[PDB]
Amino acid sequence: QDADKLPHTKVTLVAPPQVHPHEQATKSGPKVVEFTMTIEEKKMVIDDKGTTLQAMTFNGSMPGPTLVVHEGDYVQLTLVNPATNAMPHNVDFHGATGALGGAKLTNVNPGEQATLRFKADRSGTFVYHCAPEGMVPWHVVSGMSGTLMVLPRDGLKDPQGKPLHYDRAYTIGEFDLYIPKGPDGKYKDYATLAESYGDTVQVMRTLTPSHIVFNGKVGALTGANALTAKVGETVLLIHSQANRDTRPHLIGGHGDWVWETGKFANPPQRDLETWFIRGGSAGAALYTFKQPGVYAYLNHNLIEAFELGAAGHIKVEGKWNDDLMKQIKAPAPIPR
Amino acid sequence: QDADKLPHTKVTLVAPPQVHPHEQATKSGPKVVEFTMTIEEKKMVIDDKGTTLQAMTFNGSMPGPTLVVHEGDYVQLTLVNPATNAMPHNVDFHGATGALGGAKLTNVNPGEQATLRFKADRSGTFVYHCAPEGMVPWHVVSGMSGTLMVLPRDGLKDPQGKPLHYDRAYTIGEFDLYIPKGPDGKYKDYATLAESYGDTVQVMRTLTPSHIVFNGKVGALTGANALTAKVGETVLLIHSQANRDTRPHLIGGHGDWVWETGKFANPPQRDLETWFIRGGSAGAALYTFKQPGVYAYLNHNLIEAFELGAAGHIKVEGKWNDDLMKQIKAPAPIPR
Amino acid sequence: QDADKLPHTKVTLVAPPQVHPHEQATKSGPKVVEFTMTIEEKKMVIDDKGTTLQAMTFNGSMPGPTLVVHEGDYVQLTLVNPATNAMPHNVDFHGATGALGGAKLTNVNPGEQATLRFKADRSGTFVYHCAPEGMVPWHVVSGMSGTLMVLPRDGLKDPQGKPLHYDRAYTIGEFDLYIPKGPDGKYKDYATLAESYGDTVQVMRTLTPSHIVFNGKVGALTGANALTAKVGETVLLIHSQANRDTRPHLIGGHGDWVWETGKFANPPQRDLETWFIRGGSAGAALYTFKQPGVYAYLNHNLIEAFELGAAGHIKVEGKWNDDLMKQIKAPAPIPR
Ligand SMILES: [Cu+2]
Ligand SMILES: [Cu+2]
Ligand SMILES: [Cu+2]
Ligand SMILES: [Cu+2]
Ligand SMILES: [Cu+2]
Ligand SMILES: [Cu+2]
C-alpha cells in the first residue's frame, strides 16, 4: 500500500530502560506511525567519582528511546534540534533504506526540525544514531543512539515457527566512552561541548574506552534503578551498541532464544550463555525467569563489566527452585 | 525426576588438554554426577623469558578440568579452598540456573569447602569460572575458568539430525593475561598473590593483554605437549575464553562442524575456516583429519597467536593425500 | 575424479575491487584451474598526509586478487617471488587441506617460484595469506592476503534452496596497519622493508592499529575509485580480514543475504544491518540496490571507519523511491 493513503497513529515514547506500550502479534493493518524526538546536549555525570561527559542525546537519555513498529508500517519521525543546542545533528536509521539511513534528509541545525518517513520493511531490532558529516563517531560515542524494533506482524517466532511472547521488554544501550584526562591524571571537565572535541578524538583513536556504561552511567541499572521481573515472566532484553562490540550475558540465566544479529526473520539460537552484539547493531534475547534473586546482566568481558561499567542488575521476585539448583552443603570447614 | 531420588555416580577429573572418559550417546538415565575440585593459587612461569603470573586455578591447571555430563543429569560439585590459599573463591557455572550461576552458594574462604547441585538442563559447552564479589575479573584473568560440557543424551547431531561422533576430545582454555611491568620495562615478579592485585588491575583496565596463552603458558600445547591425532580420526576441540573474544583456526584444516556459541541444540555450521568464541563462553568444533603433519591450532588474530602466545600444535600421523593437496613444482629458480 | 586426468583451464586475475569473470551456476565439470601470482614488496602511501607503509603484496595490490573456482575444482597456483624482493614468502590457503594450508609447500625465496595444487572441496569465501615461519603476522599485516571464492557448482542458494544470483562482485580487503612513530610524533618512513620490522612488531604487540584501510589506503574506494552500481542490481560484497575482526555495514542499505562466516553450505542470514567478519576469514553479503545515491560501506566501529580509514563509497545510479523513504518536511525552523 501507498503510505500516503494509510492510517496514521502517534506514539508517545518512554524513557529507557522501559519500552513504550505496543502489541506483539497484531490484527492491525499497516500504519504510518508518528514519533517525535528532541535532541538534548547536556553534561552528564557518568561514574561514582564525579567524572562528566559532554553528552549528546535523543530525548534526554542514553540510549534514546526505543521506537516499536510492525513490519510493513512506516516510521515517520520528527527530529527536533532546539536552539539551545550547539551542534547540528541528524538521524541514520539502520532499519531504513536510502539516503544514508535518512541522515541526508534530516540534517538539522540548532533551531530546526525535519520529518522523515521510511518503510519498516524488515523485522528486527535496528540501531539508529546521529551521523553528521565530519563528526560521526563523536556524536555516536557521546550518546546519540538507540533502537528501532520492527516486530513481525504476527509476533516473534522460534525456529519451528512457534509463537514466542514476552511479558516485558527492556532496552539497554551500551556506550563506550572516551573521556580525556589531563596531565594531572584526572578526567577533564569541559565548560562546553565544543571544547571537548579535540581531546576526545585523540582518546577515540586509541580505541580504548575510559568507561563502558549501560544507559548513561556506571551503575545506571542498579539499586532503585535495577531492572525487575518475577519468576515465570518472560523478558525481552534489547541490547544496542552503535560503535563497538559487546557480549551480553545474564549471570545465573541464559538467552533462551537470541537473535544476536537482531533480525527476526532469521531463526534464533537457544540456550546461549553469552551472545554477541556487533558494533553498529542491536540484538534481542528472550529469557523466562525460573529463580528469584538479583541477577547481573553484563558485557562478559569482565574487565569491561566490572572495571569499566558495563553491568546492570535484574531483581527477580518469586520462589526458589531446588530442582534447578540446591546448596547441598553450605561453606564449612574442610573435612579432616 | 527428583534428583534426590536419582542414582549418583562419581567422576575422576583429568587434567587438560585431555577430557575425562565419557560416553557420547548413552542409554543411561539421568544421574547426579559428583565432582570435586580443589583450588590452588600458585606462581606460574608463563613464557620463555621467565615471566611469572600470580595465578589462581581450579585443580592446579589453567584451564580447570572439563566436566562432562549429559543433558538432564545433575552436576554436584564439591569445591574445596585449602587453608594454604590466601583468597576466597567460588564458582559460577554458566550451565546452571540461579544464584549467580552458583557463586552465591559456593563462597569458600581458605579452609572451607561447599557442595552445589544444579540441573544440567541445557546441552552445550559452558564456561565455569570463579567470581568473588569485588574481584571477579581478577580471579578469571588469573586462571580460574574451565568448561562444563553437557552432551545431548543421544550424542551430537548435524543440522539434519545425523549423528556426529568424535574419537577424542581436547580442551583448550585461552587466557588473556595482564602482567604488570615496572619502571625498568621488565615484568614484575611478586612474592604473594595479594601483592600483584593493584598493579594488575591497572593493566587490565587498558584492555591490552601482555600475553594470551593456551593452557597456562606460551607454547603449552607444543613439543612433547602437542595435541595428537591420526588421519581418519575425528577430534572435538573445546575452546573456552572466560573473559575475551577469540577466533580459533586450524591451519591446514577446518571446522567440519562448529557450534561457535557452544550450544548443541542449535544446528552447527560447516566448513568454517575460523570461528568465534565470545568472551564468556565455550564453543566446540569437530574435525576429521585427512592429512598428516604438524598443524597449528591458534587464535587468528595472528599477533595474538604468534606474538602473544595464543597458538598450539596438533601432530597428526598417517598417509599424505595428493588428491587433497600436491606440490606440483617445488620451489625452484623462476623460469627464464 | 583424479585431478591428474581433469581438464585444465587458466584464469587471468584482475585487480581488486573487481573480481575476474566467472560463472555462478555452471554446467562445467570439475577442472584444474591454473592461476599465477607474483609477489611485490613496495613502499605505499596509505593516507592523505603522506604516511608510508613498507608493504608486501600478492600481485601488486592490497588485497591480493580474488581467485574464483567452483566446488570440486582444483586450484593450481604458481607463486612467484622475484629476485627484486628481499623476503621469503609462501601462501596459506584457508580453502585447502594440509601442509599448513600449502605454506609448507610454497616457501619461495627471492628468485624462486613454486606450484601448488589443492582440491577446493568446500564452498565459501576463504582467506589466503602469506605465512613465513617466524614472521607470519608481519607479512599479513603488511598486506599479504586475499580471498579464494569457491562457489557451489549450482550457484548461491538461500535457506530454502532458492537461487541467489548477483550481477557484480566486489572484493574488499580490510587491513589493520601498525605504522611506527618516532620520538617526534611523526610516522616513520623506512628506506627498506627489513628496516621496518622491529619497530612494527612493537606496535603490533599493542594490538592498536595506526590505520585500518580498505584496499590499501585511506579513501581507496572513494572518488574516482568508488564502487558503482545501479538501482535493481544485486551486488556480492566479499570482505576479507586476515588478522583482525571487522563489522561491515552498508549505510542506507542492508545485507539481504549474508554468510558472515563465509561458507556457502550454511544458510545465510537475512536483513542484517551489520555483520561480523572474524579475523582470519572472509565473508560475503548480497544486496540489491533499491535507492540511488552515494552509500558508504564501512566497518561499523565508527572510529575505525571514520578516524582510522575503514570506509568506502558505492555510487548508485537510478530512480529515487519515495515508498521506501521520503522527506516529509525538509529542515526548517521549529514551529512556534
Ligand atoms: Cu548528533
Ligand atoms: Cu550506522
Ligand atoms: Cu577465585
Ligand atoms: Cu560468567
Ligand atoms: Cu610474505
Ligand atoms: Cu590463516
mmCIF file with all atom_site columns, N, CA, C and O in Angstrom, chain C residues 179-203:
data_model
loop_
_atom_site.group_PDB
_atom_site.id
_atom_site.type_symbol
_atom_site.label_atom_id
_atom_site.label_alt_id
_atom_site.label_comp_id
_atom_site.label_asym_id
_atom_site.label_entity_id
_atom_site.label_seq_id
_atom_site.pdbx_PDB_ins_code
_atom_site.Cartn_x
_atom_site.Cartn_y
_atom_site.Cartn_z
_atom_site.occupancy
_atom_site.B_iso_or_equiv
_atom_site.pdbx_formal_charge
_atom_site.auth_seq_id
_atom_site.auth_comp_id
_atom_site.auth_asym_id
_atom_site.auth_atom_id
_atom_site.pdbx_PDB_model_num
ATOM 1   N N  . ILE C 1 179 ? 51.783 1.204  11.812 1.00 0.00 ? 179 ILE C N  1
ATOM 2   C CA . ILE C 1 179 ? 52.892 2.028  11.347 1.00 0.00 ? 179 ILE C CA 1
ATOM 3   C C  . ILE C 1 179 ? 53.559 2.706  12.530 1.00 0.00 ? 179 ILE C C  1
ATOM 4   O O  . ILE C 1 179 ? 52.898 3.397  13.299 1.00 0.00 ? 179 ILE C O  1
ATOM 5   N N  . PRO C 1 180 ? 54.856 2.476  12.697 1.00 0.00 ? 180 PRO C N  1
ATOM 6   C CA . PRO C 1 180 ? 55.544 3.080  13.865 1.00 0.00 ? 180 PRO C CA 1
ATOM 7   C C  . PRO C 1 180 ? 55.652 4.590  13.731 1.00 0.00 ? 180 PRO C C  1
ATOM 8   O O  . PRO C 1 180 ? 55.719 5.173  12.657 1.00 0.00 ? 180 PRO C O  1
ATOM 9   N N  . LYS C 1 181 ? 55.757 5.211  14.885 1.00 0.00 ? 181 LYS C N  1
ATOM 10  C CA . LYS C 1 181 ? 56.115 6.623  15.051 1.00 0.00 ? 181 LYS C CA 1
ATOM 11  C C  . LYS C 1 181 ? 57.477 6.722  15.711 1.00 0.00 ? 181 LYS C C  1
ATOM 12  O O  . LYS C 1 181 ? 57.919 5.827  16.406 1.00 0.00 ? 181 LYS C O  1
ATOM 13  N N  . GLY C 1 182 ? 58.116 7.847  15.425 1.00 0.00 ? 182 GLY C N  1
ATOM 14  C CA . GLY C 1 182 ? 59.353 8.160  16.145 1.00 0.00 ? 182 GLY C CA 1
ATOM 15  C C  . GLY C 1 182 ? 59.080 9.103  17.260 1.00 0.00 ? 182 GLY C C  1
ATOM 16  O O  . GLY C 1 182 ? 57.986 9.534  17.555 1.00 0.00 ? 182 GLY C O  1
ATOM 17  N N  . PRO C 1 183 ? 60.193 9.446  17.933 1.00 0.00 ? 183 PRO C N  1
ATOM 18  C CA . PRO C 1 183 ? 60.120 10.284 19.128 1.00 0.00 ? 183 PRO C CA 1
ATOM 19  C C  . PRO C 1 183 ? 59.558 11.666 18.853 1.00 0.00 ? 183 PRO C C  1
ATOM 20  O O  . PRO C 1 183 ? 59.155 12.274 19.842 1.00 0.00 ? 183 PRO C O  1
ATOM 21  N N  . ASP C 1 184 ? 59.557 12.141 17.625 1.00 0.00 ? 184 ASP C N  1
ATOM 22  C CA . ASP C 1 184 ? 58.978 13.425 17.265 1.00 0.00 ? 184 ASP C CA 1
ATOM 23  C C  . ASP C 1 184 ? 57.497 13.315 16.995 1.00 0.00 ? 184 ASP C C  1
ATOM 24  O O  . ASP C 1 184 ? 56.869 14.279 16.568 1.00 0.00 ? 184 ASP C O  1
ATOM 25  N N  . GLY C 1 185 ? 56.881 12.157 17.205 1.00 0.00 ? 185 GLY C N  1
ATOM 26  C CA . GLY C 1 185 ? 55.466 12.042 16.997 1.00 0.00 ? 185 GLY C CA 1
ATOM 27  C C  . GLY C 1 185 ? 55.030 11.858 15.560 1.00 0.00 ? 185 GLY C C  1
ATOM 28  O O  . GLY C 1 185 ? 53.829 11.859 15.316 1.00 0.00 ? 185 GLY C O  1
ATOM 29  N N  . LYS C 1 186 ? 55.950 11.726 14.633 1.00 0.00 ? 186 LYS C N  1
ATOM 30  C CA . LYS C 1 186 ? 55.665 11.539 13.242 1.00 0.00 ? 186 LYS C CA 1
ATOM 31  C C  . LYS C 1 186 ? 55.817 10.055 12.890 1.00 0.00 ? 186 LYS C C  1
ATOM 32  O O  . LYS C 1 186 ? 56.618 9.332  13.435 1.00 0.00 ? 186 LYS C O  1
ATOM 33  N N  . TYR C 1 187 ? 54.994 9.601  11.931 1.00 0.00 ? 187 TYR C N  1
ATOM 34  C CA . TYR C 1 187 ? 55.159 8.250  11.413 1.00 0.00 ? 187 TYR C CA 1
ATOM 35  C C  . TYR C 1 187 ? 56.522 8.136  10.767 1.00 0.00 ? 187 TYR C C  1
ATOM 36  O O  . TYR C 1 187 ? 57.003 9.047  10.107 1.00 0.00 ? 187 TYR C O  1
ATOM 37  N N  . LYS C 1 188 ? 57.117 6.968  10.948 1.00 0.00 ? 188 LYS C N  1
ATOM 38  C CA . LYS C 1 188 ? 58.405 6.704  10.349 1.00 0.00 ? 188 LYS C CA 1
ATOM 39  C C  . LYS C 1 188 ? 58.254 6.315  8.902  1.00 0.00 ? 188 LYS C C  1
ATOM 40  O O  . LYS C 1 188 ? 57.323 5.663  8.493  1.00 0.00 ? 188 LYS C O  1
ATOM 41  N N  . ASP C 1 189 ? 59.258 6.687  8.106  1.00 0.00 ? 189 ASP C N  1
ATOM 42  C CA . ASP C 1 189 ? 59.403 6.306  6.705  1.00 0.00 ? 189 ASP C CA 1
ATOM 43  C C  . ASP C 1 189 ? 60.719 5.568  6.620  1.00 0.00 ? 189 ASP C C  1
ATOM 44  O O  . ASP C 1 189 ? 61.780 6.045  7.017  1.00 0.00 ? 189 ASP C O  1
ATOM 45  N N  . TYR C 1 190 ? 60.660 4.361  6.138  1.00 0.00 ? 190 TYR C N  1
ATOM 46  C CA . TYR C 1 190 ? 61.820 3.496  6.088  1.00 0.00 ? 190 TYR C CA 1
ATOM 47  C C  . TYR C 1 190 ? 62.339 3.353  4.654  1.00 0.00 ? 190 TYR C C  1
ATOM 48  O O  . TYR C 1 190 ? 61.585 3.241  3.711  1.00 0.00 ? 190 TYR C O  1
ATOM 49  N N  . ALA C 1 191 ? 63.670 3.269  4.562  1.00 0.00 ? 191 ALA C N  1
ATOM 50  C CA . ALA C 1 191 ? 64.305 3.066  3.274  1.00 0.00 ? 191 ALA C CA 1
ATOM 51  C C  . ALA C 1 191 ? 64.149 1.668  2.724  1.00 0.00 ? 191 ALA C C  1
ATOM 52  O O  . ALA C 1 191 ? 64.150 1.539  1.529  1.00 0.00 ? 191 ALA C O  1
ATOM 53  N N  . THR C 1 192 ? 64.038 0.669  3.587  1.00 0.00 ? 192 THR C N  1
ATOM 54  C CA . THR C 1 192 ? 63.891 -0.720 3.170  1.00 0.00 ? 192 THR C CA 1
ATOM 55  C C  . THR C 1 192 ? 62.819 -1.401 4.027  1.00 0.00 ? 192 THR C C  1
ATOM 56  O O  . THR C 1 192 ? 62.498 -0.982 5.123  1.00 0.00 ? 192 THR C O  1
ATOM 57  N N  . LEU C 1 193 ? 62.325 -2.510 3.455  1.00 0.00 ? 193 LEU C N  1
ATOM 58  C CA . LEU C 1 193 ? 61.367 -3.325 4.176  1.00 0.00 ? 193 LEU C CA 1
ATOM 59  C C  . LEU C 1 193 ? 61.955 -3.871 5.433  1.00 0.00 ? 193 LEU C C  1
ATOM 60  O O  . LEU C 1 193 ? 61.352 -3.809 6.529  1.00 0.00 ? 193 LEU C O  1
ATOM 61  N N  . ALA C 1 194 ? 63.166 -4.416 5.354  1.00 0.00 ? 194 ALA C N  1
ATOM 62  C CA . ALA C 1 194 ? 63.732 -5.022 6.563  1.00 0.00 ? 194 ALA C CA 1
ATOM 63  C C  . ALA C 1 194 ? 63.887 -4.026 7.701  1.00 0.00 ? 194 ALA C C  1
ATOM 64  O O  . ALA C 1 194 ? 63.709 -4.365 8.871  1.00 0.00 ? 194 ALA C O  1
ATOM 65  N N  . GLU C 1 195 ? 64.210 -2.786 7.388  1.00 0.00 ? 195 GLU C N  1
ATOM 66  C CA . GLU C 1 195 ? 64.401 -1.763 8.423  1.00 0.00 ? 195 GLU C CA 1
ATOM 67  C C  . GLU C 1 195 ? 63.155 -1.472 9.216  1.00 0.00 ? 195 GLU C C  1
ATOM 68  O O  . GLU C 1 195 ? 63.249 -0.999 10.346 1.00 0.00 ? 195 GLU C O  1
ATOM 69  N N  . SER C 1 196 ? 61.974 -1.773 8.659  1.00 0.00 ? 196 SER C N  1
ATOM 70  C CA . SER C 1 196 ? 60.727 -1.504 9.337  1.00 0.00 ? 196 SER C CA 1
ATOM 71  C C  . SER C 1 196 ? 60.345 -2.556 10.368 1.00 0.00 ? 196 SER C C  1
ATOM 72  O O  . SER C 1 196 ? 59.430 -2.300 11.165 1.00 0.00 ? 196 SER C O  1
ATOM 73  N N  . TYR C 1 197 ? 60.984 -3.715 10.383 1.00 0.00 ? 197 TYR C N  1
ATOM 74  C CA . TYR C 1 197 ? 60.478 -4.866 11.107 1.00 0.00 ? 197 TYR C CA 1
ATOM 75  C C  . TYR C 1 197 ? 60.383 -4.649 12.614 1.00 0.00 ? 197 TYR C C  1
ATOM 76  O O  . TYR C 1 197 ? 59.312 -4.823 13.196 1.00 0.00 ? 197 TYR C O  1
ATOM 77  N N  . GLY C 1 198 ? 61.496 -4.316 13.283 1.00 0.00 ? 198 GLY C N  1
ATOM 78  C CA . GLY C 1 198 ? 61.464 -4.334 14.738 1.00 0.00 ? 198 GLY C CA 1
ATOM 79  C C  . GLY C 1 198 ? 60.481 -3.341 15.315 1.00 0.00 ? 198 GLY C C  1
ATOM 80  O O  . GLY C 1 198 ? 59.761 -3.569 16.268 1.00 0.00 ? 198 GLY C O  1
ATOM 81  N N  . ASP C 1 199 ? 60.500 -2.152 14.736 1.00 0.00 ? 199 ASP C N  1
ATOM 82  C CA . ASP C 1 199 ? 59.613 -1.102 15.199 1.00 0.00 ? 199 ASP C CA 1
ATOM 83  C C  . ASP C 1 199 ? 58.135 -1.509 14.980 1.00 0.00 ? 199 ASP C C  1
ATOM 84  O O  . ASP C 1 199 ? 57.277 -1.203 15.795 1.00 0.00 ? 199 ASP C O  1
ATOM 85  N N  . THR C 1 200 ? 57.857 -2.164 13.841 1.00 0.00 ? 200 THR C N  1
ATOM 86  C CA . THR C 1 200 ? 56.495 -2.584 13.556 1.00 0.00 ? 200 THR C CA 1
ATOM 87  C C  . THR C 1 200 ? 56.042 -3.618 14.520 1.00 0.00 ? 200 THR C C  1
ATOM 88  O O  . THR C 1 200 ? 54.884 -3.554 14.973 1.00 0.00 ? 200 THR C O  1
ATOM 89  N N  . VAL C 1 201 ? 56.874 -4.611 14.807 1.00 0.00 ? 201 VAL C N  1
ATOM 90  C CA . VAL C 1 201 ? 56.459 -5.628 15.758 1.00 0.00 ? 201 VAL C CA 1
ATOM 91  C C  . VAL C 1 201 ? 56.060 -5.027 17.092 1.00 0.00 ? 201 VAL C C  1
ATOM 92  O O  . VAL C 1 201 ? 55.072 -5.461 17.711 1.00 0.00 ? 201 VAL C O  1
ATOM 93  N N  . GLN C 1 202 ? 56.804 -4.019 17.560 1.00 0.00 ? 202 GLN C N  1
ATOM 94  C CA . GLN C 1 202 ? 56.439 -3.396 18.819 1.00 0.00 ? 202 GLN C CA 1
ATOM 95  C C  . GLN C 1 202 ? 55.046 -2.758 18.757 1.00 0.00 ? 202 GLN C C  1
ATOM 96  O O  . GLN C 1 202 ? 54.236 -2.909 19.696 1.00 0.00 ? 202 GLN C O  1
ATOM 97  N N  . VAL C 1 203 ? 54.744 -2.100 17.644 1.00 0.00 ? 203 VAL C N  1
ATOM 98  C CA . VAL C 1 203 ? 53.405 -1.527 17.502 1.00 0.00 ? 203 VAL C CA 1
ATOM 99  C C  . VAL C 1 203 ? 52.356 -2.638 17.440 1.00 0.00 ? 203 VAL C C  1
ATOM 100 O O  . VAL C 1 203 ? 51.293 -2.564 18.048 1.00 0.00 ? 203 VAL C O  1
#
